[PDB]
Scaffold this active site. Sequence first.
Site, PDB file in Angstrom:
ATOM      1  N   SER B  49       0.786  -1.236   0.000  1.00 23.98           N
ATOM      2  CA  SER B  49       0.000   0.000   0.000  1.00 23.98           C
ATOM      3  C   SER B  49       0.824   1.295   0.000  1.00 23.98           C
ATOM      4  O   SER B  49       0.380   2.314  -0.523  1.00 23.98           O
ATOM      5  CB  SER B  49      -0.926   0.018   1.217  1.00 23.98           C
ATOM      6  OG  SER B  49      -1.866  -1.066   1.202  1.00 23.98           O
ATOM      7  N   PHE B 172       0.738  -3.426   3.833  1.00 24.14           N
ATOM      8  CA  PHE B 172       0.565  -4.804   4.275  1.00 24.14           C
ATOM      9  C   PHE B 172       0.574  -5.760   3.081  1.00 24.14           C
ATOM     10  O   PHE B 172      -0.295  -5.690   2.219  1.00 24.14           O
ATOM     11  CB  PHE B 172      -0.748  -4.925   5.052  1.00 24.14           C
ATOM     12  CG  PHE B 172      -1.046  -6.309   5.539  1.00 24.14           C
ATOM     13  CD1 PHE B 172      -0.076  -7.052   6.202  1.00 24.14           C
ATOM     14  CD2 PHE B 172      -2.309  -6.865   5.357  1.00 24.14           C
ATOM     15  CE1 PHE B 172      -0.358  -8.331   6.681  1.00 24.14           C
ATOM     16  CE2 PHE B 172      -2.606  -8.146   5.830  1.00 24.14           C
ATOM     17  CZ  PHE B 172      -1.625  -8.879   6.494  1.00 24.14           C
ATOM     18  N   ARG B 214       1.809  -1.856  13.633  1.00 20.22           N
ATOM     19  CA  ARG B 214       2.587  -1.077  12.681  1.00 20.22           C
ATOM     20  C   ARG B 214       2.476   0.416  12.990  1.00 20.22           C
ATOM     21  O   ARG B 214       3.388   1.178  12.680  1.00 20.22           O
ATOM     22  CB  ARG B 214       2.139  -1.363  11.246  1.00 20.22           C
ATOM     23  CG  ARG B 214       0.721  -0.968  10.946  1.00 20.22           C
ATOM     24  CD  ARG B 214       0.334  -1.399   9.548  1.00 20.22           C
ATOM     25  NE  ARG B 214      -1.086  -1.186   9.310  1.00 20.22           N
ATOM     26  CZ  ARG B 214      -1.694  -1.424   8.153  1.00 20.22           C
ATOM     27  NH1 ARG B 214      -1.003  -1.889   7.117  1.00 20.22           N
ATOM     28  NH2 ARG B 214      -2.994  -1.187   8.032  1.00 20.22           N
TER      29      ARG B 214
HETATM   30  C1  MX1 Z   1      -3.183  -0.734   1.100  1.00 16.01           C
HETATM   31  O1  MX1 Z   1      -3.566   0.323   1.618  1.00 16.01           O
HETATM   32  C2  MX1 Z   1      -4.119  -1.940   0.737  1.00 16.01           C
HETATM   33  N1  MX1 Z   1      -5.050  -2.198   1.828  1.00 16.01           N
HETATM   34  C3  MX1 Z   1      -4.668  -2.652   3.084  1.00 16.01           C
HETATM   35  O2  MX1 Z   1      -3.496  -2.978   3.360  1.00 16.01           O
HETATM   36  C4  MX1 Z   1      -5.745  -2.739   4.165  1.00 16.01           C
HETATM   37  C5  MX1 Z   1      -5.224  -2.108   5.434  1.00 16.01           C
HETATM   38  O3  MX1 Z   1      -4.233  -2.593   6.024  1.00 16.01           O
HETATM   39  O4  MX1 Z   1      -5.770  -1.082   5.895  1.00 16.01           O
HETATM   40  C6  MX1 Z   1      -6.149  -4.176   4.389  1.00 16.01           C
HETATM   41  C7  MX1 Z   1      -5.639  -4.915   5.461  1.00 16.01           C
HETATM   42  C8  MX1 Z   1      -6.010  -6.243   5.666  1.00 16.01           C
HETATM   43  C9  MX1 Z   1      -6.900  -6.847   4.794  1.00 16.01           C
HETATM   44  O5  MX1 Z   1      -7.261  -8.159   4.993  1.00 16.01           O
HETATM   45  C10 MX1 Z   1      -7.422  -6.140   3.723  1.00 16.01           C
HETATM   46  C11 MX1 Z   1      -7.045  -4.809   3.525  1.00 16.01           C
HETATM   47  O6  MX1 Z   1      -3.419  -3.163   0.322  1.00 16.01           O
HETATM   48  C12 MX1 Z   1      -2.350  -3.148  -0.638  1.00 16.01           C
HETATM   49  C13 MX1 Z   1      -4.921  -1.499  -0.579  1.00 16.01           C
HETATM   50  N2  MX1 Z   1      -4.028  -1.049  -1.648  1.00 16.01           N
HETATM   51  C14 MX1 Z   1      -4.400   0.052  -2.442  1.00 16.01           C
HETATM   52  C15 MX1 Z   1      -3.402   0.422  -3.498  1.00 16.01           C
HETATM   53  O7  MX1 Z   1      -3.643   1.285  -4.367  1.00 16.01           O
HETATM   54  O8  MX1 Z   1      -2.291  -0.153  -3.513  1.00 16.01           O
HETATM   55  C16 MX1 Z   1      -5.603   0.731  -2.251  1.00 16.01           C
HETATM   56  C17 MX1 Z   1      -6.084   1.885  -3.028  1.00 16.01           C
HETATM   57  C18 MX1 Z   1      -6.515   0.253  -1.154  1.00 16.01           C
HETATM   58  O9  MX1 Z   1      -5.843  -0.475  -0.109  1.00 16.01           O
END
Ligand code: MX1
Lengths: 246, 228
Positions: B49, B172, B214
């Site tokens: 992310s 994550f 985190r």
């Molecule tokens: C990153 O933001 C994204 N989402 C998560 O990591 C999110 C969180 O930790 O808040 C999450 C956590 C546990 C889960 O089982 C499901 C989701 O993951 C890569 C995702 N990525 C995006 C991107 O553009 O890379 C987004 C726009 C939305 O979130």
Amino acid sequence: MGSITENTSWNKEFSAEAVNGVFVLCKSSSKSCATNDLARASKEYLPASTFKIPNAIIGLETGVIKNEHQVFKWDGKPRAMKQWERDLTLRGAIQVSAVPVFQQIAREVGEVRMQKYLKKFSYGNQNISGGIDKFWLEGQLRISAVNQVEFLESLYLNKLSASKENQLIVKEALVTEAAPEYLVHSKTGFSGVGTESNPGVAWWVGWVEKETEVYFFAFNMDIDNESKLPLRKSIPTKIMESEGII
Amino acid sequence: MGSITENTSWNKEFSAEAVNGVFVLCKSSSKSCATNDLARASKEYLPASTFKIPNAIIGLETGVIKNEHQTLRGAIQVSAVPVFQQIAREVGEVRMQKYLKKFSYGNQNISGGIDKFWLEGQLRISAVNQVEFLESLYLNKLSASKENQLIVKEALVTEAAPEYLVHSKTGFSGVGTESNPGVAWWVGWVEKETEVYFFAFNMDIDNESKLPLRKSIPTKIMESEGII
Ligand SMILES: *C(=O)[C@](NC(=O)[C@H](C(=O)O)c1ccc(O)cc1)(OC)[C@@H]1N=C(C(=O)O)C(=C)CO1
Ligand SMILES: *C(=O)[C@](NC(=O)[C@H](C(=O)O)c1ccc(O)cc1)(OC)[C@@H]1N=C(C(=O)O)C(=C)CO1
């Protein structure tokens, strides 16, 4: 601004605290705004600290403020408030309403340029008389809640006569609350306790940026005792909370 | 940055939660950084992310993204993974590859799907490389318009206070596999008075329950340091 409708419901929040004031709220734009008082909504009051917003934009536009990272050095000389006795960034100066920083900016900008920009910004009555460094603190400058909202909307849209860059810089400096679903930009103001049977005015203006919607607001109230300031935020906050905005 | 110093004392917050990870905190004025583990500070992991930061910048710079109102902050905050996979597709591998080189972003490896290389691909970046990247952003020194860098900087605001503003993005990669736990991230910077603190945090993770750590751990450290 097009149109402004009354919303008698919000009045309860004012009666409860026995406060005389106004709240203007506009969804999406200033095309359709609601208020608890049509008359007061367009009544003009001294902007006080809320003038720090246009003051900062003009400072950057004119080059008086070099860039978003300029530091306003404290010269060690005594200042009206202890929180102003230290170096400050632009955001820092805005948040604590560091008068001397903005007075130095005003003097450097000068009366001719200050007048010019307030005209381009359609800022209230555009009256800057009474001293280049204090017209917004105790002068004849006056602006209404409606005009504040129109002004903030222009800023939000980058429609003011200034580089998008400078408008973005000031907007970030105005962030006061951050939440995953919404970012709040705002500025408070207070003209003082006033004179014999002539209360001062307290302000809270700004806008809320949501997922796909933006809300513009402006609030002001009469006040004769500094112990009333908390109302300046609680009333508007309680109202916007009611609308599900914040 | 100008220098980095290892301070094992921070391991305190790590042992308490029984967590393997690293925290990098740099002071802009002194241009010096501090970390609980030099070795892991340079270890490169999947950005996940946190890749949305450089992603968003590239999207605006290539015109793929309308404007801050198109909203961008909503795109970086209110999830919606497919949204940025869209932007990547439109950006294309040629341009994407060019910007990461300009940004000097991690190993600059975008192989394995132009719309998922940062989620499970070969892209890797260290904590130190994250803070250097974020500092360039803060200083508008990235190879992009100042306007676009400013737009992205505000979109990243996650906490506001009278004395400080926090800009950040979590990451994550998943619970991972057996002896190969996933990685969790929290990177950003803090504008506290006239000082600026850039930070990068990552930890091994095999259970989403520990996910809150985190933010939790870095926050405790920055509090003991009187940052936030
Ligand atoms: C990153 O933001 C994204 N989402 C998560 O990591 C999110 C969180 O930790 O808040 C999450 C956590 C546990 C889960 O089982 C499901 C989701 O993951 C890569 C995702 N990525 C995006 C991107 O553009 O890379 C987004 C726009 C939305 O979130
Ligand atoms: C801004 O509004 C503020 N006060 C004033 O501008 C005001 C004035 O000079 O007009 C003032 C100055 C000194 C005083 O002792 C009393 C009033 O500072 C620039 C600031 N804003 C406040 C607010 O939150 O509304 C305050 C509570 C304090 O003053």
